[PDB]
Amino acid sequence: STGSATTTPIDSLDDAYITPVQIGTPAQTLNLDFDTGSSDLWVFSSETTASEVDGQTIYTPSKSTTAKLLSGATWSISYGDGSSSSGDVYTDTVSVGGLTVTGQAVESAKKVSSSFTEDSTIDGLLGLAFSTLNTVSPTQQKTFFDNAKASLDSPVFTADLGYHAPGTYNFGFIDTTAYTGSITYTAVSTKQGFWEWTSTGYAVGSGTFKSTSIDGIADTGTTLLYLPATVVSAYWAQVSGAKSSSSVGGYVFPCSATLPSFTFGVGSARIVIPGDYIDFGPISTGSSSCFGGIQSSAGIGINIFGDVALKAAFVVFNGATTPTLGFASK
Numbered sequence: 001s002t003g004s005a006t007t008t009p010i011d012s013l014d015d016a017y018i019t020p021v022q023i024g025t026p027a028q029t030l031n032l033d034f035d036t037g038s039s040d041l042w043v044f045s046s047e048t049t050a051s052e053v054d055g056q057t058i059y060t061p062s063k064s065t066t067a068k069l070l071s072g073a074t075w076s077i078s079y080g081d082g083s084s085s086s087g088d089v090y091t092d093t094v095s096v097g098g099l100t101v102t103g104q105a106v107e108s109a110k111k112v113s114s115s116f117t118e119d120s121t122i123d124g125l126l127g128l129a130f131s132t133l134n135t136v137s138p139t140q141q142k143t144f145f146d147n148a149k150a151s152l153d154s155p156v157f158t159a160d161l162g163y164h165a166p167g168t169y170n171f172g173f174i175d176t177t178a179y180t181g182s183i184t185y186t187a188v189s190t191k192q193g194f195w196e197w198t199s200t201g202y203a204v205g206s207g208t209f210k211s212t213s214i215d216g217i218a219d220t221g222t223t224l225l226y227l228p229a230t231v232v233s234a235y236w237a238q239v240s241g242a243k244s245s246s247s248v249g250g251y252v253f254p255c256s257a258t259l260p261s262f263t264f265g266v267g268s269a270r271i272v273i274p275g276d277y278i279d280f281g282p283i284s285t286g287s288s289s290c291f292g293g294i295q296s297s298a299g300i301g302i303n304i305f306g307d308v309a310l311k312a313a314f315v316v317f318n319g320a321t322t323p324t325l326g327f328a329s330k
């Protein structure tokens, strides 16, 4: 089997991407944030504290004839931005782009933190990291991909995120028309439960490539590109007037600047992030100071190839017995 679904930026900055997901019988379609950095499929629901729902579409398990409460199971997750959610667990039928899993754990939120409430465009998350990170207790549950994988034509999914544009998540096949050149595959460590890999280095604009190992994670659920302080300093030094602002929480730059590209290495291959992908717009409405899309990972303890990087590539998440990651230009 295969599935294919369009993924859409939630806003004009590409802060996150939503993909429609059918849950239950009859289907309840929710727009979920596919997150290769976590491993829980959780949704706003009829059980979510009413004051914490503000415009999201909710899953109502009592209206799904295939929903079954998973006895005694709860979940609770925290994300790197300080946000969180928690609740109970149903199993139900879940379909993405024509690919159907029965018995998928659907984590129904009883509580969500303010950032989720305040974002009406995201109805929940669909985790695509390794199932070892799933938070359901006392019996950990499998991700949608893990449940689907044996049925897929090939045990893979691909992320083709758009810059200010629609994109695609495919399951079970590689669309060879969706990229240029070849896909370069690189080794993955699952030791932290992530799609963790080692980039071979970077370049800033038209500058010389610096060969250096940068271990980080391919994370569709993180907006920005978080890299070591030395690398990030080298990037922003090429932007006149850019500064690291303690009050804002990272590098900012004059909105009138033209940003250089940023290149990262995948083996001998190179993925070029155009400068405008690094512009996250005014720090507050009407400001002429803009937020940068490349930020230091020093405070977070891991490098993160988030959407800024991934949307410059066609990315293969290869879930073969030994997982690998593939990157192609597009």
Ligand SMILES: Cc1nc(N)sc1Cc1ccc(C#N)cc1
Binding pocket: 010, 015, 016, 033, 035, 036, 037, 038, 079, 080, 081, 082, 083, 119, 122, 219, 220, 221, 222
């Ligand atoms: C921080 C984080 N990192 C992940 N890999 S998920 C996640 C939680 C999250 C989900 C949606 C949005 C938006 N808009 C922002 C943060």
